[PDB]
């Protein structure tokens, strides 16, 4: 399988998000309700986006930290396909969210941003979690933290544990060759698509490069 | 000084939250916009609740995990006084949220969960963070995790490091004596107030017990 392409709608309001979706919804595989849009608009953003694009996978990037069953159910009742749980959530939070995902035939991803451990990685695996998002923090990036070999070896290690790995966090087109040879499940782009002079070209170039590399 | 009482509005809609606030707004110190309510309604929950109760401290329990400046600014533009940042956030995320908080004369709390370390705690202090929320996860609680010895020791050590400590996570009235003798800044009660037969009397019982235990 080729890595899928996900657009992150890190917008504060629906109308701002639609400025992007009206250009590129058909140019990507997955539409993400970004955490910024989850907090700006609430779960209506999931419901509205899935009604607009029912044939796309909709990911609610809620970064659930507790109340796994409650928050997941809210997102799944709004018709999310997938939801995120932040890495430092209690293991029972992740388990809870996953139990609810299964009722809706959806899925849970653990968002790996900031501090987490390899022991937690094993715990998620034993809990039946099959997806992680290897996600360089926007704020770490802004402080000058680049992608590096340690990221590549961590991603390969996660893949080898049986996770379908998503790669994200200020990704630019030119970053993609860093990950060649790894069976990446999804690459996410937010800013590099939404804020490009031509969002359509930016999305197609991502897809082109992925097809060439994989 | 008496521990203050915070009500957690973990409601999915505003009207459900108001069924509680109309009863207990004046019976508590801090009004928390629960994570559940932030995700249910979005940041308008902060704006609306502050407009109803402008004289109270309003906490947006956003549990910010990244994009500290952006999310914190959304909450503070909605007139929040305090915001939460989840403890595994990159340190620059915590710093970013605090930078924006100071611009609004507000504050940030680090919300404790997972496998945080004492060196990370020192980082938060060094970054200028003065509040932490020592929380038992709802889901841990449902799996049978109880308050106990290790919690008391950790809370005391956080206080000695200079943090004001909030304690929370399925607190019932009978849990308060466990923390006697520790200078707790805030106790949060969500379910134990919202779901009581009489929310007003539940809140007052918490206040009476605190006044006795810390008096
Ligand atoms: O490509 P970006 O602008 O960094 O956005 C994608 C990223 O995954 C964000 O949505 C995010 O969740 N950051 O924490
Ligand atoms: O007393 P509760 O129903 O547990 O609610 C308070 C708690 O702090 C929640 O608001 C929360 O943030 N749980 O993670
Ligand atoms: Mg995101
Ligand atoms: Mg809360």
From Swiss-Prot, chain A:
It is an enzyme of class 4 (lyase). Induction: Induced by L-ascorbate. Repressed by UlaR. Pathway: Cofactor degradation; L-ascorbate degradation; D-xylulose 5-phosphate from L-ascorbate: step 2/4. Keywords: Carbohydrate metabolism, Decarboxylase, Lyase, Magnesium, Metal-binding. Pfam families: OMPdecase (PF00215). SMART domains: OMPdecase. One of its GO terms (biological process) is 'de novo' pyrimidine nucleobase biosynthetic process. Substrate binds at residues 10, 191. Mg(2+) binds at residues 32, 61. The record marks 63, 66 as: Transition state stabilizer. Binds 1 Mg(2+) ion per subunit. Changing residue 66 to A: 5% of wild-type activity. Its cofactor is Mg(2+). It catalyses: 3-dehydro-L-gulonate 6-phosphate + H(+) = L-xylulose 5-phosphate + CO2. GO terms for molecular function: 3-dehydro-L-gulonate-6-phosphate decarboxylase activity; magnesium ion binding; orotidine-5'-phosphate decarboxylase activity. SUPFAM superfamilies: Ribulose-phoshate binding barrel. Its EC number is 4.1.1.85. Catalyzes the decarboxylation of 3-keto-L-gulonate-6-P into L-xylulose-5-P. Is involved in the anaerobic L-ascorbate utilization. The reaction mechanism proceeds via the formation of a Mg(2+) ion-stabilized 1,2-cis-enediolate intermediate. The active site is located at the interface of the component polypeptides. Homodimer. Belongs to the HPS/KGPDC family. KGPDC subfamily. This is 3-keto-L-gulonate-6-phosphate decarboxylase UlaD. It comes from Escherichia coli (strain K12). The gene is ulaD.
């Amino acid at each position: 399988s080729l890595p899928m392409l996900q657009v992150a709608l890190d917008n504060q309001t629906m109308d701002s998000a639609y400025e992007t979706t009206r250009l590129i919804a058909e140019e990507v595989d997955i539409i993400e309700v970004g955490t910024i849009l989850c907090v700006g608009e609430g779960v209506r953003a999931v419901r509205d986006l899935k009604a607009l694009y029912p044939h796309k996978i909709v990911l609610a990037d809620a970064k659930i930290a507790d109340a796994g069953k409650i928050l997941s159910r809210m997102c799944f009742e709004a018709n999310a396909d997938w939801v995120t749980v932040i890495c430092c959530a209690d293991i029972n939070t992740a388990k809870g969210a996953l139990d609810v995902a299964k009722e809706f035939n959806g899925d849970v991803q653990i968002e790996l941003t900031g501090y987490w451990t390899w022991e937690q990685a094993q715990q998620w695996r034993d809990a039946g979690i099959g997806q992680v998002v290897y996600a360089r923090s926007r704020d770490a990036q802004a402080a000058g933290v680049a992608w590096g070999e340690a990221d590549i070896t961590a991603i390969k290690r996660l893949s080898d544990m049986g996770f379908k790995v998503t790669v994200t966090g200020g990704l630019a087109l030119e970053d993609l060759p860093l990950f060649k040879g790894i069976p990446i499940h999804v690459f996410i782009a937010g800013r590099s698509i939404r804020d490009a002079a031509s969002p359509v070209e930016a999305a197609r170039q991502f897809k082109r490069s992925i097809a060439e590399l994989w």
